[PDB]
Target: Protein InvG
Amino acid sequence: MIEPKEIVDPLTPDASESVNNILKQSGAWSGDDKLQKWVRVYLDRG
Amino acid sequence: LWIVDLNKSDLERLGTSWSGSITIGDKLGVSLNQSSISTLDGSRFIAAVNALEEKKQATVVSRPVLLTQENVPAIFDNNRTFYTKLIGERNVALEHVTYGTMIRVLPRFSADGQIEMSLDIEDGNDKTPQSDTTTSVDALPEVGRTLISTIARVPHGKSLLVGGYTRDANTDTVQSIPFLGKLPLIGSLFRYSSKNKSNVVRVFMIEPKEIVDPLTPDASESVNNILKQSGAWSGDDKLQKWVRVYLDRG
Amino acid sequence: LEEKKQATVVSRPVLLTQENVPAIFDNNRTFYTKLIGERNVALEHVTYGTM
Amino acid sequence: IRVLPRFSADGQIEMSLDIEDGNDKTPQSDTTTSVDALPEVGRTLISTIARVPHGKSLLVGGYTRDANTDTVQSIPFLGKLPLIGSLFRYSSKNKSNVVRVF
Amino acid sequence: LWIVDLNKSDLERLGTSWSGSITIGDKLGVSLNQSSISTLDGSRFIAAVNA
Model:
């Protein structure tokens, strides 16, 4: 089968809230660590 | 960009399957299910039951980051090899999977503030027939190869999808004996049922952002918080400081 | 011997472009399944390609 | 690493980067701690011009990864009775999470 | 330039997995999990635990 659709809008909600609902529920969240947060924090908000 | 994978599968196997032969007085030989009498004369008929089931679930989320100027190309690619510990040190073996990634882009600015880019991306492992033992494939999940070739524009600081793949599947079979598999009392001792079900999504996202500022705090304070807490700091040594000090402050 | 077999599989790719520009998507996963036995060891596998 | 730098007017530096780092893919270190002794880092390659103000530090590219794995292998009938039903399980979790940035 | 790496992993493995076969009076043979009787007649069923 086939079906296209037109798209003009960004994703709602945002992608940074999608994966942070994945990683805190699949059991792989890695922001608690006080050894690795010193270099992820350069990398999440700019 | 955001790689993301979700895998989920369960499988069950239960039932018997019979074979073998009998004999009567060296005058007649009755065999069940292709058991040749030319290999067996008194070996009576046997059975085989299978019982095993499981539930598998695995996720993997990875992301590359890279910056350019506008109207200039750039390439990023990467491939690590992930090992896992097969059980045994003298009875020795290993198994390993390479995990490759590639991305090249060509961005520009618009008038109203949105970014337009030019994407070829790749991700996956190479097809390797390996990990022969049952949990050896279970240790490291597999993700297939993929390739996009797409220009796509997106408003400032927000996230748009660029392509994906989903898949759902079942399987059902009931293998049995024709006459004796329907009587109510022990008729379900002659079944052989094996369901199977897996369902997998995988999608590539993208989001750019504009950047004008240097990193806050500085990088020399980042690694000096790493090395004094991971336990590898090397400024205490009175034999090696005489040449690192030419090298930290100019 | 007799049996009854039934199987379904439903898959979908998604992708976007602009208008009047080409684009390619292709994919191939390999699906393993657990043959019964760990020391009596064997596997079997099928690649599933899409373009 | 190869580079090609120049000065700007206001004091910032603009450079031209191709960098590489890693080991070559070697199937080796067969014993269990032999891989554990020396860690592995994958190959990487950048091709980027990037400018940065004087004396401060800017990021040029990186890679992170998170993963799980869960499986519960058991016997269908006898794996649910309360008394010794958990003697027929086979559970094996797995979890790794790795960052790396230039 | 500054290379930096952080790696972290943990892994656990626990449980059993069974196999083997029995016999009754040289008249019938019941086997669990692909144990062929064509290699074994009196070798009773075994287990394997990993921890």
Notes: The CA atoms of residues 23 and 40 of chain E lie 10 Å apart. The radius of gyration of chain E is 22 Å. The beta strands of chain E are 4-6, 9-11, 14-16, 20-24, 28-32, 49-50.
